Design a protein around this nucleic acid. Structure first.
Ligand SMILES: NC[C@@H]1O[C@H](O[C@H]2[C@@H](O)[C@H](O[C@@H]3[C@@H](O)[C@H](N)C[C@H](N)[C@H]3O[C@H]3O[C@H](CO)[C@@H](O)[C@H](O)[C@H]3N)O[C@@H]2CO)[C@H](N)[C@@H](O)[C@@H]1O
Ligand SMILES: [Mg+2]
Ligand SMILES: [Mg+2]
Ligand SMILES: [Mg+2]
Ligand SMILES: [Mg+2]
Ligand SMILES: [Mg+2]
Ligand SMILES: [Mg+2]
Ligand SMILES: [Mg+2]
Ligand SMILES: [Mg+2]
Ligand SMILES: [Mg+2]
Ligand SMILES: [Mg+2]
Ligand SMILES: [Mg+2]
Ligand SMILES: [Mg+2]
Ligand SMILES: [Mg+2]
Ligand SMILES: [Mg+2]
Ligand SMILES: [Mg+2]
Ligand SMILES: [Mg+2]
Ligand SMILES: [Mg+2]
Ligand SMILES: [Mg+2]
Ligand SMILES: [Mg+2]
Ligand SMILES: [Mg+2]
Ligand SMILES: [Mg+2]
Ligand SMILES: [Mg+2]
Ligand SMILES: [Mg+2]
Ligand SMILES: [Mg+2]
Ligand SMILES: [Mg+2]
Ligand SMILES: [Mg+2]
Ligand SMILES: [Mg+2]
Ligand SMILES: [Mg+2]
Ligand SMILES: [Mg+2]
Ligand SMILES: [Mg+2]
Ligand SMILES: [Mg+2]
Ligand SMILES: [Mg+2]
Ligand SMILES: [Mg+2]
Ligand SMILES: [Mg+2]
Ligand SMILES: [Mg+2]
Ligand SMILES: [Mg+2]
Ligand SMILES: [Mg+2]
Ligand SMILES: [Mg+2]
Ligand SMILES: [Mg+2]
Ligand SMILES: [Mg+2]
Ligand SMILES: [Mg+2]
Ligand SMILES: [Mg+2]
Ligand SMILES: [Mg+2]
Ligand SMILES: [Mg+2]
Ligand SMILES: [Mg+2]
Ligand SMILES: [Mg+2]
Ligand SMILES: [Mg+2]
Ligand SMILES: [Mg+2]
Ligand SMILES: [Mg+2]
Ligand SMILES: [Mg+2]
Ligand SMILES: [Mg+2]
Ligand SMILES: [Mg+2]
Ligand SMILES: [Mg+2]
Ligand SMILES: [Mg+2]
Ligand SMILES: [Mg+2]
Ligand SMILES: [Mg+2]
Ligand SMILES: [Mg+2]
Ligand SMILES: [Mg+2]
Ligand SMILES: [Mg+2]
Ligand SMILES: [Mg+2]
Ligand SMILES: [Mg+2]
Ligand SMILES: [Mg+2]
Ligand SMILES: [Mg+2]
Ligand SMILES: [Mg+2]
Ligand SMILES: [Mg+2]
Ligand SMILES: [Mg+2]
Ligand SMILES: [Mg+2]
Ligand SMILES: [Mg+2]
Ligand SMILES: [Mg+2]
Ligand SMILES: [Mg+2]
Ligand SMILES: [Mg+2]
Ligand SMILES: [Mg+2]
Ligand SMILES: [Mg+2]
Ligand SMILES: [Mg+2]
Ligand SMILES: [Mg+2]
Ligand SMILES: [Mg+2]
Ligand SMILES: [Mg+2]
Ligand SMILES: [Mg+2]
Ligand SMILES: [Mg+2]
Ligand SMILES: [Mg+2]
Ligand SMILES: [Mg+2]
Ligand SMILES: [Mg+2]
Ligand SMILES: [Mg+2]
Ligand SMILES: [Mg+2]
Ligand SMILES: [Mg+2]
Ligand SMILES: [Mg+2]
Ligand SMILES: [Mg+2]
Ligand SMILES: [Mg+2]
Ligand SMILES: [Mg+2]
Ligand SMILES: [Mg+2]
Ligand SMILES: [Mg+2]
Ligand SMILES: [Mg+2]
Ligand SMILES: [Mg+2]
Ligand SMILES: [Mg+2]
Ligand SMILES: [Mg+2]
Ligand SMILES: [Mg+2]
Ligand SMILES: [Mg+2]
Ligand SMILES: [Mg+2]
Ligand SMILES: [Mg+2]
Ligand SMILES: [Mg+2]
Ligand SMILES: [Mg+2]
Ligand SMILES: [Mg+2]
Ligand SMILES: [Mg+2]
Ligand SMILES: [Mg+2]
Ligand SMILES: [Mg+2]
Ligand SMILES: [Mg+2]
Ligand SMILES: [Mg+2]
Ligand SMILES: [Mg+2]
Ligand SMILES: [Mg+2]
Ligand SMILES: [Mg+2]
Ligand SMILES: [Mg+2]
Ligand SMILES: [Mg+2]
Ligand SMILES: [Mg+2]
Ligand SMILES: [Mg+2]
Ligand SMILES: [Mg+2]
Ligand SMILES: [Mg+2]
Ligand SMILES: [Mg+2]
Ligand SMILES: [Mg+2]
Ligand SMILES: [Mg+2]
Ligand SMILES: [Mg+2]
Ligand SMILES: [Mg+2]
Ligand SMILES: [Mg+2]
Ligand SMILES: [Mg+2]
Ligand SMILES: [Mg+2]
Ligand SMILES: [Mg+2]
Ligand SMILES: [Mg+2]
Ligand SMILES: [Mg+2]
Ligand SMILES: [Mg+2]
Ligand SMILES: [Mg+2]
Ligand SMILES: [Mg+2]
Ligand SMILES: [Mg+2]
Ligand SMILES: [Mg+2]
Lengths: 272, 49
RNA sequence: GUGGGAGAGGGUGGUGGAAUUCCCGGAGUAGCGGUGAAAUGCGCAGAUACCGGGAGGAACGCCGAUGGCGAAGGCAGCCACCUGGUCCACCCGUGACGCUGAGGCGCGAAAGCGUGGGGAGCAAACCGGAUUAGAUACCCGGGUAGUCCACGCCCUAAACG
RNA sequence: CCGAGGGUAGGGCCCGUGACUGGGGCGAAGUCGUAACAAGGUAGCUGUACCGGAAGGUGCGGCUGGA
RNA sequence: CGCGGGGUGGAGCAGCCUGGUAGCUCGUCGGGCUCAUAACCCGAAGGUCGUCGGUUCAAAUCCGGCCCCCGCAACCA
RNA sequence: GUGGUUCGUGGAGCCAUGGGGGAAUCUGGGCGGACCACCGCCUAAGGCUAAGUACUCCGGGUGACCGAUAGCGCACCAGUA
RNA sequence: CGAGCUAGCCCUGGCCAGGGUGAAGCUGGGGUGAGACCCAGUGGAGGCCCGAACCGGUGGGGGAUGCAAACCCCUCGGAUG
RNA sequence: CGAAUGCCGGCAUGAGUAACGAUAAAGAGGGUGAGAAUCCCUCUCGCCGUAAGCCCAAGGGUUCCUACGCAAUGGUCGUCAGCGUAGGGUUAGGCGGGACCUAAGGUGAAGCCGAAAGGCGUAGCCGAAGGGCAGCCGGUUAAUAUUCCGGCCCUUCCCGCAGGUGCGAUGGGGGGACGCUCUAGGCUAGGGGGACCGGAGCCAUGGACGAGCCCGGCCAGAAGCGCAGGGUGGGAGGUAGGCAAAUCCGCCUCCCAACAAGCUCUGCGUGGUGGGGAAGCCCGUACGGGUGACAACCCCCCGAAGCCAGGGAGCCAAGAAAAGCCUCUAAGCACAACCUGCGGGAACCCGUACCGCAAACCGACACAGGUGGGCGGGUGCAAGAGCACUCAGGCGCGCGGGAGAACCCUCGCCAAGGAACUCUGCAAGUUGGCCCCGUAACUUCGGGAGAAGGGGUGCUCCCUGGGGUGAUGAGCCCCGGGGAGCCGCAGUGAACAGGCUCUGGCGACUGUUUACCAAAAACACAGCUCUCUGCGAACUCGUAAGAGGAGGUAUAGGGAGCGACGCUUGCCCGGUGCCGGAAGGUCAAGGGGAGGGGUGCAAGCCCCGAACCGAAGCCCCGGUGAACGGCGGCCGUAACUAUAACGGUCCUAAGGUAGCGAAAUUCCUUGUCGGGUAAGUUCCGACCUGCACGAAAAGCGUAACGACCGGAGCGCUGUCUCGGCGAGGGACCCGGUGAAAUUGAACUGGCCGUGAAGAUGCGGCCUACCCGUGGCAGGACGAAAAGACCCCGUGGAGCUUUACUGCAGC
RNA sequence: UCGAUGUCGGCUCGUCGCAUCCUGGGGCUGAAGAAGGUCCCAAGGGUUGGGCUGUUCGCCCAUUAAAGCGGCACGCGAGCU
């Protein structure tokens, strides 16, 4: 989708909005299973650690289910599909037959009315979740766990997905939304299908405000400030850095790798 | 234009208050000295009810 | 209308094997590439050649024809779904309902453009090496757009019988 | 009231003209190269695309007006 | 005015700093191939080293003065 | 690897120690300025211990100390206005 | 010792007269094989417009031992973000 | 002590000088008094009136009210006061806050961390104009009143009775509970009108005894009614979820409802009763009282932004928590308890005066400044909180009186010309609201547009079309149309209200910024690209714990640059960086000990110490430019000259492509052409010899946007030729109060000289009676700041880097 | 002169020198006349308005009897810009 606009105001011409057709007549969220008071704040205890944040629409947290072995075997019916301000993926709310309700990040396909479930059993269909081993090599899938019982963590962004590649001992090779081939443990669930609402990468914010709404204040270039507060700074009419591009704190930012070398997680990785 | 003193009872006891100064090691010393110097008033005289 | 036939006709989903390129393991050395001849290039930091495994893209050998299908552009591994055209027999139905067709509208190879994806091979531009008087060329070693996918454009041709 | 015309303001079409600029035509015997016609010494032509003093080259698909 | 770099056969350039030996490419000239020109092949010629001085046994070379050439600098007022 | 001592890496002991290694109970151990021999001196890895010493919020005494711009900031309801 | 000024952010409240312009979307008609689309009418969008409050502070003049250690007069920017 | 721009103090000079704090404005009569422009009173005048009037909150803290007072405070005066002395004055179960709840954030048992101090920290606790919660209208005081009094109406507790039910928690669930914009229906606040009702009165000056003028025609109010409107399905089975249990909630599955029919729940009317009730006139105030009065207290119309409220619709940026409340059960308990009515009793603490857009708050001041919320009438102007006037109400700004100079400020007008002004149309003018005609290039189809340029606008009469409220009508109120006619110079007749256009530069745009000299072309900005990061992420803060990132997960997060959009962004990887290289070379501690030394009679003890094994880094091999960067010189050549498509050569890592170009870049330079002008160092269009453009420190464009910057024209004008007159506030004179920086002392002239080189002071000459007042600024190298430039000091700071040396960090 | 002598130009206001631009007087002329040339005397008065540039200065445009050169802290900011 992606709503468009006629130019009746510069900016609201290039501006592009999402299409909330996929939003089952829902909107008002569900008390109980979410929401919780969401403590918004751009800095830690005192100081500001991440810069340029703050401001932007008030938000309510939708406490989603990111570990599904909670209900192994208990099937549930997908009730609605709603908007979640805390993420890029739309989320689906679903009523188990157990009578319990919980939200799930909604996969592309999954339609309201559908029945979905989790566990070793589970049929390989959009929405169902199973330990990685039991999933057919090659099938795509989202909401992966990295270590058994620790909760989902990979491919959860709007319309992202990972594809299974092979098996190898108690591990199974994956291919993350980034292109890295990772070795994940067999016992990590991963609900099947891709995340959906993949038009998300196409929304043209539009104006200055639009960014402000999502809580992101203006970002000033180092080049603009002085030597006192950033490498690229001073002296006359602009300047060409004058040294290898660096961050406010001073480490190179055009090429310098960061992953800490001797990490134990190294051996389970294979790509880029 | 607007100036720098905008009186506020709450802020004043809340900041230069007595329990305020007792709470920290530096403030307790603030008291010591003032006590040791004589000062009729150890801390500002906030008021009302 | 009835009952049959052939076909790379069209769209969608899926799938198979050969080969190339890369990665990993093995084993193995002093050269491999390349050309008119060469050089650039690659190779003891272990290349080429050989075996094993894995990844990925694109194109479908034999069948294949001087064959088939389409209005053209064009269409080729295999499977299923949706779908167009068309030939024969039977002479059952309508009953002149026909032909062409300014304009309109649709389709329209390759290259090109937008947005996103993909990128193995190839390859404008570009970089080298030779050739030459010179080479902004032909030849050789690299190589990016593009070539592939989806959606939206562009409307050209020796779009030729 | 209408009304010749005059006034003011803004448009439409056409003609003339202009520093300088673009390509074209024409003009016996100036320069550079050799693209095409013989297999033209890289078959040629082509739509498109990028590049080059120049003819032109190269990519992609195409045509026989070549084999 | 100040600073430092450069003048070498017809053309463009080496050769000096560690003085004695001027080299490269093109061009020029004679011959060859060609029907002829070029390309190409074989042979040959060509430099008071910007000038006036001395330094040495010996100066393109080292050291002073002018002669043009090029490049830089000329700020704070 | 450092701190302490006069000792600033010096021939650098001694006394403390963060790190690593890691004993013995008198024929046991430490020290006398690297080290070794000899000759000697002490007996580490537990603790306490008056007095002699420092100070002056406070009381008292005395001044070749001041005498209201001095002397405490304040002789006076001053850490006040 | 200070964020009772100023800067940013967090939590919780409040304010923005009245005028313009008229987006999507609806509905009707037209169109087609179905569409695209085109007409009206409806609709009430927007860091849209005029303009107070309010937030500013463009130009000029005055003030310059001032009314004022940043003011006054005329003029002017924004004013649903 | 004579100097230190010395320190403390005192008193001079400037000087009766400047001032006396908004140009809203005063005049008189009568009081009081020792003394009145300044205090009280009355009359007249003027100013505010989306306030300069009322009501809260903050802050202040007696300023409140009253009596007696003027030394000081008051910019004058003062009999007055916000001043001095004294006395009085602030009354709550229902207002606000607390014996209620939670927010950010604090604090913090458990726990974690830190040399000490301390730092973190889920529970809990604290924390509020947010949630919850029971009082409305009058009357009284010199001063308090939702507090006292009257009327009417409520809330909790505790104890009884009376009757109902399994009652029962800090535990489960429900609810509370939530955005922005736009909105309907019905109400209310508030306002307009009345031939009706009620009122003292009044006919003036030519007319009017009139459906005349003037004034007023309400307020609260339980239950019950009515009218609006908000909430809500009712059964029954089954259950494995809501961290124990539930009959509750949730999820299934059958029924009857789909309606607000019914239950409740608010709001508004009406309501027993309770109150208020003008002008005017009489009074004595410093003000209130009396009468009007048995006051009347009725009918229309406009109507909210407020009420019903959790109403509705649309949109994306997706919009607190906890308690009260309802329900559910657990322990326990069911002679308890809880629910419902009825009584009786109990109901604490703190605030309460006054100021409150300001003389009581923040600005040293009775300071032209700053200060949050609510009410804010009428008429007219299209509307409105605009503007003009004016209700209620409040003021005339705590020095006056004269004068009628220069000059200044603010204002008004002007013959002829009109930008000649000037750096610049700076300033000022012109234009201006509404309605209707009519509007170009260009363009991202929105725009450009209020383009431009025009016409209309008052009042009177006639005819006539729509609504709204009332019944389908009168009225009352909104919108319209047509035709005659009247008057002035002029009809948005006053006030509020764009001058327009053409063409360049920069930046896309709305925004943002140097609080107090820069608002911009600077920053930001959507968007583009590069790079890091697989999640206990990178990064940041922190010694740590910890947190932010993020309750996010590659369509995500960090960093860098570029900066809408269009067309595009060439070549160089030699040097620097970063990226990739289980080979080499170097390389520290450590391992290793060939060999050597010191002492021992010796076993020994203690030292050095070569091979060799030894990381990262560097070296080295490769890559990489939307990484730091860089992107040539000299000669010759065409059949007129000229120029050079062509060639030679030298050196690079490669030798700037497209596009643009005398530029926000051009030194020479007012380059040379062309355009605008009578005339053009600027401006626009070209050429290219680009001192010294050039492609994400982006390149060249670009509609729209701009308090940005340049050039031009129209319109208009006191900018100007070139001034003139007029207004007011000062200036001046008089009475009252009365500063200042400055100051070696002064009895302080011109000239030509001279002097440390610029003399009132020295020489010579000239001039010159003593002292002021308004004026002008040439001078006293005039005042003001121990020059902000420059240099100096082995002075200081901020900043940089392949300066040195360290440290964090890796 | 740095315990401060405000600095270009413009404006306003002047004033002074003469090595005179004009007007007045004069000599020589290769002075027929008219108009010039050149020098001598002479400062009494006069010595324009515009375009461009911050400009001084210049170059223009239109005129004039002429469109003089200099000084006064590149005269004059307790006079202005
Ligand atoms: N008519 C020819 C048109 O112009 C071009 O041709 C033009 C040029 O290429 C051509 O130039 C030629 C040159 O090619 C050739 N190699 C040398 C010759 N001297 C030149 O000649 C030219 O100049 C000379 C003297 O002035 C004249 O007399 C002659 O007419 C003229 N053609 O002269 C032509 C104009 O006259 C295109 N090549 C051709 O395809 C096109 O159709
Ligand atoms: Mg909640
Ligand atoms: Mg912190
Ligand atoms: Mg803290
Ligand atoms: Mg930025
Ligand atoms: Mg800066
Ligand atoms: Mg720095
Ligand atoms: Mg820099
Ligand atoms: Mg610069
Ligand atoms: Mg038949
Ligand atoms: Mg046909
Ligand atoms: Mg096509
Ligand atoms: Mg194609
Ligand atoms: Mg994009
Ligand atoms: Mg290839
Ligand atoms: Mg050849
Ligand atoms: Mg090739
Ligand atoms: Mg054909
Ligand atoms: Mg023309
Ligand atoms: Mg040929
Ligand atoms: Mg050929
Ligand atoms: Mg050819
Ligand atoms: Mg081609
Ligand atoms: Mg090519
Ligand atoms: Mg030491
Ligand atoms: Mg000893
Ligand atoms: Mg010894
Ligand atoms: Mg001893
Ligand atoms: Mg012992
Ligand atoms: Mg002791
Ligand atoms: Mg004495
Ligand atoms: Mg004293
Ligand atoms: Mg005395
Ligand atoms: Mg003292
Ligand atoms: Mg519409
Ligand atoms: Mg609107
Ligand atoms: Mg706006
Ligand atoms: Mg506005
Ligand atoms: Mg002395
Ligand atoms: Mg004194
Ligand atoms: Mg005086
Ligand atoms: Mg005076
Ligand atoms: Mg005076
Ligand atoms: Mg006053
Ligand atoms: Mg008035
Ligand atoms: Mg008092
Ligand atoms: Mg009083
Ligand atoms: Mg009195
Ligand atoms: Mg007085
Ligand atoms: Mg005063
Ligand atoms: Mg008296
Ligand atoms: Mg008093
Ligand atoms: Mg409490
Ligand atoms: Mg109590
Ligand atoms: Mg807490
Ligand atoms: Mg704490
Ligand atoms: Mg609490
Ligand atoms: Mg509260
Ligand atoms: Mg209350
Ligand atoms: Mg009162
Ligand atoms: Mg119960
Ligand atoms: Mg409960
Ligand atoms: Mg609850
Ligand atoms: Mg009469
Ligand atoms: Mg009532
Ligand atoms: Mg349970
Ligand atoms: Mg009365
Ligand atoms: Mg609602
Ligand atoms: Mg609680
Ligand atoms: Mg009170
Ligand atoms: Mg009160
Ligand atoms: Mg107020
Ligand atoms: Mg006053
Ligand atoms: Mg005031
Ligand atoms: Mg205000
Ligand atoms: Mg009102
Ligand atoms: Mg109006
Ligand atoms: Mg007003
Ligand atoms: Mg005039
Ligand atoms: Mg006139
Ligand atoms: Mg005119
Ligand atoms: Mg002018
Ligand atoms: Mg002038
Ligand atoms: Mg201008
Ligand atoms: Mg102006
Ligand atoms: Mg412009
Ligand atoms: Mg302009
Ligand atoms: Mg801008
Ligand atoms: Mg500001
Ligand atoms: Mg400023
Ligand atoms: Mg601005
Ligand atoms: Mg400013
Ligand atoms: Mg964390
Ligand atoms: Mg988080
Ligand atoms: Mg990023
Ligand atoms: Mg920039
Ligand atoms: Mg910029
Ligand atoms: Mg580039
Ligand atoms: Mg490079
Ligand atoms: Mg390299
Ligand atoms: Mg490199
Ligand atoms: Mg490396
Ligand atoms: Mg190494
Ligand atoms: Mg140029
Ligand atoms: Mg330049
Ligand atoms: Mg001209
Ligand atoms: Mg002009
Ligand atoms: Mg010109
Ligand atoms: Mg540039
Ligand atoms: Mg760049
Ligand atoms: Mg730019
Ligand atoms: Mg702006
Ligand atoms: Mg004037
Ligand atoms: Mg006057
Ligand atoms: Mg006087
Ligand atoms: Mg003198
Ligand atoms: Mg004397
Ligand atoms: Mg004298
Ligand atoms: Mg003077
Ligand atoms: Mg001075
Ligand atoms: Mg000094
Ligand atoms: Mg300087
Ligand atoms: Mg030194
Ligand atoms: Mg000086
Ligand atoms: Mg002095
Ligand atoms: Mg003379
Ligand atoms: Mg003469
Ligand atoms: Mg003069
Ligand atoms: Mg001078
Ligand atoms: Mg000058
Ligand atoms: Mg001067
Ligand atoms: Mg001045
Ligand atoms: Mg002076």
């Amino acid at each position: 989708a992606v709503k468009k606009f006629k130019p009746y105001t510069p900016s609201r011409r290039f501006m592009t909005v999402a299409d909330f057709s996929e939003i089952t007549k829902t909107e008002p969220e569900k008390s109980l299973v979410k929401p919780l008071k969401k403590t918004g704040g751009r800095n830690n205890q005192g100081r500001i650690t991440v810069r340029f944040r703050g401001g932007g629409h008030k938000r309510l947290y939708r406490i989603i289910d990111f570990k599904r072995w909670d209900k192994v075997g208990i099937p549930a019916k997908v009730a609605a599909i709603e908007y979640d301000p805390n993420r890029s993926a739309r989320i689906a709310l679903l009523h188990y037959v157990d009578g319990e309700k919980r939200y799930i990040i909604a996969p592309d396909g999954l339609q309201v009315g559908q029945q979905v479930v989790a566990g070793p059993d589970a049929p390989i269909q959009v929405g169902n979740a199973l330990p990685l081993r039991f999933i057919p090599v090659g099938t795509v899938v989202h909401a992966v766990e990295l270590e058994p019982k620790k909760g989902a963590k990979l491919a959860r962004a709007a319309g992202t997905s990972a594809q299974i590649q092979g098996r190898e001992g108690d591990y199974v090779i994956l291919r993350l939304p980034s292109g890295e081939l990772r070795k994940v443990h067999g016992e990590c669930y991963a609900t099947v299908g891709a995340v959906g609402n993949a038009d998300h990468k196409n929304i043209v914010l539009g104006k200055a405000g639009r960014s402000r709404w999502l809580g992101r204040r203006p970002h000033v270039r180092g080049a603009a400030m002085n030597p006192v507060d950033h490498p690229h700074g001073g002296g006359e009419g602009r300047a060409p850095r004058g040294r290898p591009p660096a961050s406010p704190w001073g480490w190179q930012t055009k090429g310098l790798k960061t992953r800490k070398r001797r990490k134990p997680s190294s051996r389970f990785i294979i790509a880029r | 234009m607007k100036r720098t003193w905008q009186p506020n009872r709450r802020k004043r006891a809340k900041t230069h208050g007595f329990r305020a100064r007792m709470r920290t090691p530096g403030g307790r010393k603030v008291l010591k000295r003032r006590r040791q110097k004589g000062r009729w008033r150890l801390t500002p005289a906030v008021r009302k009810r």
